[model samples]
Target: MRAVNWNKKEDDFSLMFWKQNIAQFWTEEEIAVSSDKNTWVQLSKEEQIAYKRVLGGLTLLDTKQGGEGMPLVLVHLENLQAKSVLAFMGAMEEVHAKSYSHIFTTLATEEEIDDIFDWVDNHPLLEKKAGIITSYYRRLLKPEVTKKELYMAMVASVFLESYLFYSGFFYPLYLAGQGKLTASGEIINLIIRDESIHGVFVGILAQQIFAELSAEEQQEVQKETQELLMELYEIEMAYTEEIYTSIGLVEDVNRFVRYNANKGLMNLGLEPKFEEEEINPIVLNGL
Candidate 1:
């Protein structure tokens, strides 16, 4: 059996990512999100609903990436370094999930927390998004996954890290831009940083495997990816409407999501699926 050799003689990607992940490692407890309670109580009912509901949706997605997707993908990887860094990332996904709970417990009552999670369970579009992503991870778990299938699995991960989380992320940072809930915003910021690295690293692996495909296979793969992206885009817009419509933030949230959706596509060597638009500069600064 080949043991892990961490000389960094090559595979610069893993080493670079591993170091980056280490340098920025943080925990939810480090932030005083409880301090956001003062700002929390002052917000309108719609604002509070948007805050908790958006995070509830995020908690579900992070839970999937951590408890389901990452470990399942590990079953197919060959490089020890890749395996190790990915394991760290999966654990961080757990941290991302738990961070929200801490914020919830800080600002919400036991009943509110229970109801928000219940809302997440019943949100059809949200469940569909998680369903689509987990399906890819499950595909990775197959007894004999081909390189193409494995590459697609990593691509799905980038979508989760890069594209799918943005709607949930948008509202918190929007609140922070207005100087409301800034402390809790720091927690969201930390998760965003972790996710960016996760996307880049996972996308890099997908790119490598992508290059190994036959020319015809590459054609089909990109074609397939575009089709999948459009489907996700449709689902996301509807989900965005449900989460942000009452608060009158749907338009900006869509613009922000489309911008990040482009980033997600470009991460995997695919052209952007949407025409570009400027995101809110204040919210951009929050990033």
Candidate 2:
């Protein structure tokens, strides 16, 4: 049997994040979503639709990250202690996914849930976005994987954790700011705290892997990361337009996305790729 060196001394940086993750442990069941039922009914039709679609998309991403992406990367990790940190992160992704289910169950009907799932499947931009992430993970499954390939894949993970979730995160917080869905919003706040830690930890790990690369390879990865960031930023804006244009929050949501993308770059020790913009004050308050 393979042995675990619990006393192993490595960088131990991830250990701090792991402790924070443990302290913040929460479950969907712990939050009371029943209070949101009335708030759900009180929301305007447009607000309601926007909320569900955003949350539905978030659910799909969390599900994929938890179920497929994490396991794929976990096996390749060289550090056993880091592995445990990622394992906790993977488990929290599922919790975030299930937290959406809890929100939906409290606020939606079976038919509505079915419709949301169907909408997620049919969303062109979302599927394309998922493809971008899946492509990186698929590269790792090849018989011969380079450290460069692995670092890029982990960069993709940082993108998903840091940037991608914000647009979906906006609505619940937006509602909360307006004195609606406070309970569900609290759950989202918890998830955000978890994801923020996850992104920071994974970004650190990615940076460590990156430090292992040759100078030329490092420059190549940096260029590619910037390109990917811009491409995904544009793609996300389009997706945001489709979902948020009608609600008239597209500009605000896009700003939030850009802000988070820059934050992601900073976490990876790269300069922000976009002009810095302030997050919506209300959303910031909710967070």
Which candidate's TM-score is highest?
1
Model 1, CA-based lDDT: 0.88
Models 1 onward score TM values of: 0.97, 0.97
Tens-digit per-residue lDDT, 19-44, candidate 2: 88999999999988998888889878
Off by over 4 Å in 2: none
Give the root-mean-square deviation of each candidate in angstroms.
1.1, 1.3
Candidate 2: residue 129 lDDT (0-100): 92
- Backbone clashes, candidate 2: 0
Misplaced by over 4 Å in model 1 are 8-10
Which consecutive 10 residues in model 2 have the weakest lDDT in total?
A: 1-10
Compute the lDDT of residue 24 as modeled in candidate 1: 83
Candidate 1 lDDT by residue in tens digits, 196-281: 98988888889889988999888888877887788888999999998888988899999988988899998997788789888887
Clashes of each: 0, 0
